[PDB]
Amino acid sequence: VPFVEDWDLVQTLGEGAYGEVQLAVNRVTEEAVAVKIVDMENIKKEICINKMLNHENVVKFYGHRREGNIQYLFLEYCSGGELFDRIEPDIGMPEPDAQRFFHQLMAGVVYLHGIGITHRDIKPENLLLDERDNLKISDFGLATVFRYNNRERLLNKMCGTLPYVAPELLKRREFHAEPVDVWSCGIVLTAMLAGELPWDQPSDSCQEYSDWKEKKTYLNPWKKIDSAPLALLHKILVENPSARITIPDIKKDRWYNKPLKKGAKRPRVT
Numbered sequence: 001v002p003f004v005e006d007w008d009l010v011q012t013l014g015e016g017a018y019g020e021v022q023l024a025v026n027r028v029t030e031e032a033v034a035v036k037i038v039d040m041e042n043i044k045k046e047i048c049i050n051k052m053l054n055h056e057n058v059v060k061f062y063g064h065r066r067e068g069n070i071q072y073l074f075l076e077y078c079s080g081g082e083l084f085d086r087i088e089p090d091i092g093m094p095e096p097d098a099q100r101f102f103h104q105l106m107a108g109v110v111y112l113h114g115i116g117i118t119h120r121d122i123k124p125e126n127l128l129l130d131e132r133d134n135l136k137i138s139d140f141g142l143a144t145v146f147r148y149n150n151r152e153r154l155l156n157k158m159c160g161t162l163p164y165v166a167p168e169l170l171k172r173r174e175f176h177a178e179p180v181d182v183w184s185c186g187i188v189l190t191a192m193l194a195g196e197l198p199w200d201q202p203s204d205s206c207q208e209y210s211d212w213k214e215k216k217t218y219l220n221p222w223k224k225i226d227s228a229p230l231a232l233l234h235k236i237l238v239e240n241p242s243a244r245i246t247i248p249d250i251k252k253d254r255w256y257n258k259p260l261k262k263g264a265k266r267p268r269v270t
């Protein structure tokens, strides 16, 4: 009972705008959590969205505490770090690992879309890994409700990260939320398989993007990707968001359902 509420801040996990993420260890139990420290409406929405979240591939929210002009968000600690540091530059990672991470990303995104939430900034920096390398979607600072009382709200706000944003966000005034997150998942899949981003932004003025629309797959990063995951990327990275593949159909794709990876190495004797 005494001192069970005391947490020691032992190391900086992440820094940026606006604030830092610190690893916190409980004085009594030694339980590890991540404390998001935001130096104070945007944070009020983040807390509200985080309270709704309960899924094995979404970073858990334990609660928050306001100490004057500072908000403390208590969130799941993921010891495996970011997916970003598992991607070898210009190489990627083994195809079975990327497939497993992509299945977990799809389970997380299905869950969020199912409760009417769009993340809007899916990228490897935001995809965290637990001790068993289970992928968790993190940072709901740009997230929003796109479906309320079974009525879909079209989005118009410009946000995300240019190499991961869908082309409609740059060409159209209004757009559906769900195909935007599907596109960013395809850029994450491209990053995991080739270890590089295909373009700075998806616009006609961008040569790499024009080459993709012209199906010049003999060029990088596409030439490093096998034909089965590349056929899936041809369905995701579709300019027209109405023709773009939906997640129920991604789950029926040949590469998505290809047996590739063995389960976690279990102790055995002969």
Ligand SMILES: COC(=O)c1ccc(-c2[nH]nc3c2Cc2cc(CN[C@H]4CC[C@@H](O)CC4)ccc2-3)o1
Pocket: 012, 013, 014, 021, 034, 036, 059, 075, 076, 077, 078, 079, 080, 081, 082, 128, 138, 139, 140
């Ligand atoms: C903006 O971040 C969040 O909203 C959020 C929610 C939950 C978390 C989180 N839980 N566990 C971690 C996070 C962020 C995070 C980052 C890292 C990578 N940290 C390295 C530490 C040593 C190295 O030298 C620098 C980077 C390792 C673990 C973790 O972050």
